[PDB]
């Protein structure tokens, strides 16, 4: 039979059968209970709208993501999300399909063990396998080397790989991602008068960020230009009218990636954690990693980031090496495409964690040889 | 694939006339008069199924391969037999290796212009020198007079 390549993510759940080009169903991972009282009788009001249904009734819900930073903080809601994904968005019972979840690097063990225990006890799948979210993104590019920066919505991690041999001592995981950029944008919009507070209006700020923000090639020059002319002010129409005008908030929101001091984080930007991740590698594979830097994940879709990052790394790196940044147009679904490719391989067909194996060793089987 | 043409081989292009009538049932009133299969397939899809134009793009690109921009009825037949394939890849690749060994009687591992020329002479195919060079470069992808097994497979890829 065919395998189910699910990809929990944090912000958008992407799923679909193995062997295709794009995920079959992509929908936000939010579960929102209603918060008001409700007076109409017999309206058929449910107790929790999940997935894309709660992005249409969000006016009277309190949306809450079940995955904070890679890790899962609310297991009941995550179980509800998985149940919805299997039964309503794909309509395939899990009793007859292997599953291939994905997990960020350096995550707590208990999260992974609980994930496998749920998949084997509640949904009762035949066999499931958990894979690191960066190796898949490297599969999708058709490479076999390279250092991949997978800046998702929950957590940004940077896994270097050479000739198929991952370097476990050079993984640099940073917890700044799309959600913190949304919060920072929502916080700097208040400097013009627009106040978004409700958890429903966070979605509106996210839409503003997606449609308007861009990464500046040079920060100081853009700050000077936006403060003199008015060629940058782009307007946007809220879900009820009252258009708003975003000035130099456009390139200040995604600039937080390269200067995490804006949101008070100490660490260095995504332009310098990649160079540090390279320098921890051996001295003889640094040229190949320099030449095959891969971008993935949703947050790396800002217009103009593949040039800013290349300029920064070229500034840091030695002058002789060639710096090349691979930015495929299908960046958002790169991890899932790689997952489909991996699940479609014949050599991989014996790596699944078969159910009888789980019955013999318990949920701690995932840390064992079947990784 | 081949069964369609075989069952229509005893007939003329009137199969395409029937296809044109079927399109007139759905998409009568074509404006370009050129290769256009995306519109009819999209109209077929619009009957309630999930919208997907990637299949239409694949079908509308399966016709043009010579690169001259023209789409012949034979190119339509090629698209039809390539969108649904049963006996592709030159049947068995092991037989392809046997044929390549027959080509490399010198057993040097590199097919030269001599080997391909003599094989075509044995076939006796009447193909112009332009097509001769086209087939050579399809085989000799790096264009250095040598063709290994991988280049042989690439040259005979989708060839049966």
């Amino acid at each position: 039979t065919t395998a189910l390549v699910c990809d929990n993510g944090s912000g958008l759940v992407k799923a679909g059968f193995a062997g295709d080009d794009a995920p079959r169903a992509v929908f936000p991972s939010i579960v929102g209970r209603p918060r008001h009282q409700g007076v109409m009788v017999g309206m058929g009001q449910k107790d929790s709208y999940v997935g894309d249904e709660a992005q249409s009734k969000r006016g009277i819900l309190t949306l809450k993501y079940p995955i904070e930073h890679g890790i899962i903080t609310n297991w009941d809601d995550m179980e509800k999300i998985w149940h919805h994904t299997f039964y309503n968005e794909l309509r395939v019972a899990p009793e007859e399909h292997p599953t291939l979840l994905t997990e960020a690097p350096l995550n707590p063990k208990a999260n992974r063990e609980k994930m496998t225990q749920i998949m084997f006890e509640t949904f009762n799948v035949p066999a499931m396998y958990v894979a690191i979210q960066a190796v898949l993104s490297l599969y999708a590019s058709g490479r076999t080397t390279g250092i991949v920066l997978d800046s998702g919505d929950g957590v940004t991690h940077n896994v270097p790989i050479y000739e198929g041999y991952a370097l476990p001592h050079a993984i640099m995981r940073l917890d700044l991602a799309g959600r913190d950029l949304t919060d920072y944008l929502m916080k700097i919009l208040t400097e013009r008068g627009y106040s978004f507070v409700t958890t429903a209006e966070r979605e509106i700020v996210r839409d503003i960020k997606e449609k308007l923000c861009y990464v500046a090639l040079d920060f100081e020059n853009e700050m000077a230009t936006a403060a003199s002319s008015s060629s940058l002010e782009k307007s946007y129409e809220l879900p009820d009218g009252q258009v708003i005008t975003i000035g130099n908030e456009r390139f200040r929101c995604p600039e937080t990636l390269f200067q995490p001091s804006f949101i008070g984080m100490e660490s260095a930007g995504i332009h310098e954690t990649t160079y540090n991740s390279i320098m921890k590698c051996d001295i003889d594979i640094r040229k190949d990693l320099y030449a095959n830097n891969v971008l993935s994940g949703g947050t790396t879709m800002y217009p103009g980031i593949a040039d800013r990052m290349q300029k920064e790394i070229t500034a840091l790196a030695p002058s002789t090496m060639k710096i090349k940044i691979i930015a495929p147009p299908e960046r958002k679904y790169s991890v899932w495409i790689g997952g489909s490719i991996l699940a479609s391989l014949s050599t991989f067909q014996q790596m699944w964690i078969s159910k009888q194996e789980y019955d013999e060793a318990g949920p701690s089987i995932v840390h064992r040889k079947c990784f | 694939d081949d069964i369609y043409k075989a069952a229509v081989e005893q007939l003329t292009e009137e199969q395409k006339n029937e296809f044109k009538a079927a399109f007139d049932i759905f998409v009568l009133g074509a404006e370009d008069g050129c290769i256009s299969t995306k519109e009819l397939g999209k109209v077929m899809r619009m009957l309630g199924q999930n919208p997907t134009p990637e299949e239409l793009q694949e079908m509308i690109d399966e016709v043009d391969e010579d690169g001259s921009g023209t789409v012949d009825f034979d190119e339509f037949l090629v698209m039809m037999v390539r969108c649904m394939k049963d006996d592709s890849k030159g049947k068995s690749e092991e037989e392809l290796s046997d044929l390549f060994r027959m080509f490399d009687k010198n057993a040097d591992g590199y097919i030269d212009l001599d080997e391909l020329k003599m094989m075509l002479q044995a076939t006796g195919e009447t193909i112009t020198e332009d097509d001769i060079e086209e087939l050579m470069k399809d085989g000799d992808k790096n264009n250095d007079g040598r063709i290994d097994y991988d280049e042989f497979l690439e040259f005979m890829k989708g060839v049966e």
Partner: protein
């Protein structure tokens, strides 16, 4: 070790391949029949050796092709 152990294993396998020939209880007709059996066995061994030689030539050709492909890779 293993190399001389390999030689000993090979010679033991060959000795096992040597069938226990005992004709001291059979008429000359049975002797001729057993000789025919031996000749047919030698014919089968010759055919197998020839097929192995042809397949070894084929393998040599494929090895040359693989070397050429590796040269293409470099």
């Amino acid at each position: 070790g293993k190399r001389q152990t390999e030689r000993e294993k090979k010679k033991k396998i060959l000795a096992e391949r040597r069938k226990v020939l005992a004709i001291d209880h059979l008429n000359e007709d049975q002797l001729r029949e057993k000789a025919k059996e031996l000749w047919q066995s030698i014919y089968n061994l010759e055919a197998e050796k020839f097929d192995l030689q042809e397949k070894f030539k084929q393998q040599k050709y494929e090895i040359n092709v693989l070397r050429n492909r590796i040269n293409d890779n470099q």
